[PDB]
Design a protein around this ligand. Structure first.
Ligand SMILES: [NH3+][C@]1(C(=O)O)[C@@H](CCC[B-](O)(O)O)C[C@H]2[NH2+]CC[C@H]21
Ligand SMILES: [NH3+][C@]1(C(=O)O)[C@@H](CCC[B-](O)(O)O)C[C@H]2[NH2+]CC[C@H]21
Ligand SMILES: [NH3+][C@]1(C(=O)O)[C@@H](CCC[B-](O)(O)O)C[C@H]2[NH2+]CC[C@H]21
Ligand SMILES: [Mn+2]
Ligand SMILES: [Mn+2]
Ligand SMILES: [Mn+2]
Ligand SMILES: [Mn+2]
Ligand SMILES: [Mn+2]
Ligand SMILES: [Mn+2]
Lengths: 319, 319, 318
């Protein structure tokens, strides 16, 4: 099958990057919804690399305020190795999360095979706090800081992260859907001159102009691999309520679909993260199903499913 | 009253174009909501042609997998006759559906008086399956195929449809709202080069550009009569949930009103279909009322009701 | 603090501009939600001028069909005095409503100190009926008529309003959010040539172009003070349901924030009204909380809170 429809699925049932239990069930609920079957139904070559085994680290003391550092660092180290393996096999890595701390391992692993990659980060949050600027101490709100080359010398020696080498420059990342950014994060975003489309820019320009500007900024100079790190809380809680850090006034279901349809069309999607789906956090059974169905729809759009329709290269009027 | 506010109401209580009971009650619920009274309140000349009886056809076996062919064909044949009568009386035909298979009759009969008409098709679906590409066998998913000149030779001899002569060319129809298209339908849409604005184009351009492009595409060469075939499932199920085939990520209430406000302003609306309102498909009594109210609001906008306001040509400061 | 973050808060617990009880509780629910504390948390210099006492006028007979005229006129007269005082102290007046009839007093008071002010009116409605074009007789739908210079000779001698001097020209007001306008109001809007962006223009242009056009229409010739009169029913009832006159197909939560973020950025916000919050009109306790939280978010955006983020002028990395 086509490169843009050749996929390597990695389950990452990890929750210790944040304090809310349940996000480790994200891979289970996405698989039960029939993600793999639905992808095969749209002419995808799907290989399931299974769920990564995350061994318990019982004596995981905090680094200052930073919680579960060895567990988070090890999970990302393991994921980096697995993503690099998937990438070497000529497949688009599809990481089923799990909390967003896992992006450390997902992007690190992807950069080992494709160092020229560009990142599209769909989230309500920047996730760029350092272990020193964080007030929460949750590593799911810090993955971008460990990855950026410009933040080298600002990341202290955190236990479990000695394997980390910053793999992306501030110019190689574009944020979409921002609406809840810490002061420390806003300082970083502005001082490093990172490209971003907060909800203010989405409202001003429309998602059409947002995507036109995002893809031109990342691909204008030359075609390069795209890594889409999708936090379901990027979309409004009316679509993805079963998530840990929901923020009102989010991207619509349509905008989420549009972003992913435009990324598919480039033929350059090389890595994908579907993060922060927490089935324990739906106020009703319907809120869980709604979140899972939305996450599945986003994923299908990444691999070719289009709202105008799709057809096989045959003559439907003369079978 | 003005030509654009002179109306002939036709109730078409018909459901056999699809399997879900209740759509035949659409004319009853739209009338009970006060549609006729509300139209007269906004300076409309309204004539009620009543509800078509549609006598039972007990012996109506399927054409291959195509269900109730004689019932669907005869209902459309009689509707074509009724619409032609309304059009001859110098009135805009307002068809209260009923399932969308009735568009065969509505457009066919409208073309008998105005063969130069253009079609705006608001729907989540293309409804362009032929009796041979259809997988469901439901004729409400095939009306466009029976109407298109370019599909002549691809429509088999279906019982109840010998009266049908394709009346519109692929170039005289514009779709708005698409989001659930069958492979066969997508093949047709692309091969015939039909103009369409799926939810992807609406997201990219905005409804303003969509309407500017739709009206210029249909009216640019010369002014001609407009036929708007409105399937309530074109709007998001958060506005029109009481419908047979709902699809998430639909046109908003605002977008639905914008489309219809722009069509009214041309002064060229000549035929209108308000289809697929099913008052047995409300999960609560409020979902039915919500669907009916939305359908009524769309209809009022077609006949001049504007969000900015309306006033009579009198001095309001000196009565 | 910066001029754009230096505020004078005025509570206006008044409901007699309309028939639905509960809108007088708007200042109480907005204060309980922590509005003052949240503003101080985003580096605002906040001075609380308290809640205005509105004394009962027992024999307040109607002027034709126009209800509670002396009560509405007196409440606006008091508010005008208070807003002018806040403006003289070099602060942005922040009026917590209360029904929209209070805009007579808030804009009148503001024009006394800044006669060159420009009005942005966010609402589903025009509120431009005169005491003679009104059909409901509710004064919360007539404040713009009392304020416009072009409507002088058109407004009759209404008891409680002899203090009113029209302070704004038809060219100095921009409407955003219009979707339920009376025939008489539409006639006024068209005959006076007032600038407006009904929901039809918002749908056509997008909120980005709406704001670009609104700010250029008002500020193009030169910088001048901005008065934003925000009616919570300007936003869709899915965001602000606890309100007296809700109309479907309204401005989104995002559009409301975008309008207010753009106004903040000019540094010219000089007067603000947060009106028509009615906590007695929520179908559930959550509907009230949702309306109050939305109104608080709009207010915070007016004084600098930005969705991209905010930071203090310090080195966060050192
Ligand atoms: N900046 C945050 C942090 O925890 O660092 C966000 C982290 C969000 C992480 B996520 O979902 O994007 O991966 C959540 C916010 N709430 C108070 C702390 C704030
Ligand atoms: N294209 C369809 C068909 O029945 O052929 C749709 C028909 C749409 C009918 B309507 O509402 O636009 O009139 C319903 C879908 N479900 C599976 C088959 C699909
Ligand atoms: N124009 C109105 C009026 O009462 O004059 C509106 C007044 C709304 C005032 B408000 O909420 O914008 O401040 C309410 C409408 N319903 C029938 C009469 C109409
Ligand atoms: Mn997030
Ligand atoms: Mn995140
Ligand atoms: Mn249809
Ligand atoms: Mn449909
Ligand atoms: Mn108002
Ligand atoms: Mn209003």
């Amino acid at each position: 099958s086509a490169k843009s429809r050749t996929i390597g699925i990695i389950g990452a049932p990890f929750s210790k990057g944040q304090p809310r239990g349940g996000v480790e069930e994200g891979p289970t609920v996405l698989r039960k919804a029939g993600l793999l079957e639905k992808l095969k139904e749209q002419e995808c070559d799907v290989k399931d690399y299974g769920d990564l085994p995350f061994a318990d680290i019982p004596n995981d003391s905090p680094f200052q305020i930073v919680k579960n550092p060895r567990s988070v660092g090890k999970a990302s180290e393991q994921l980096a190795g697995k993503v690099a393996e998937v990438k070497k096999n000529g497949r688009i890595s599809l990481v089923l999360g799990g909390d967003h701390s896992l992006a450390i391992g997902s992007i690190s692993g992807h950069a080992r095979v494709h160092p020229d990659l560009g990142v599209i980060w769909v989230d309500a949050h920047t996730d760029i706090n350092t272990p020193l600027t964080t007030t929460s101490g949750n590593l799911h709100g810090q993955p971008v800081s460990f990855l950026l080359k410009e933040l080298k010398g600002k990341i202290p020696d955190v236990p479990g992260f000695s394997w980390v080498t910053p793999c992306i420059s501030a110019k190689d990342i574009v944020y979409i859907g921002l609406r809840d950014v810490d002061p420390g994060e806003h300082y970083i975003l502005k001082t490093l001159g990172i490209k971003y489309f907060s909800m203010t820019e989405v409202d001003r320009l429309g998602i059409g102009k947002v995507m036109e500007e995002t893809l031109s900024y990342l691909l204008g100079r030359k075609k390069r691999p795209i890594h889409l790190s999708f936090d379901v809380d990027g979309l409004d809680p009316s679509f993805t309520p079963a998530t840990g850090t929901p923020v009102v006034g989010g991207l619509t279901y349509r905008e989420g679909l549009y972003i992913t349809e435009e990324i598919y069309k480039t033929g350059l999607l090389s890595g994908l993260d579907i993060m922060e789906v927490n089935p324990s956090l739906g106020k009703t059974p319907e809120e869980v199903t709604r979140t899972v169905n939305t996450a599945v729809a986003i994923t299908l759009a990444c691999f070719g499913l289009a709202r105008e329709g799709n057809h096989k290269p045959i003559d439907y009027l003369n079978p």
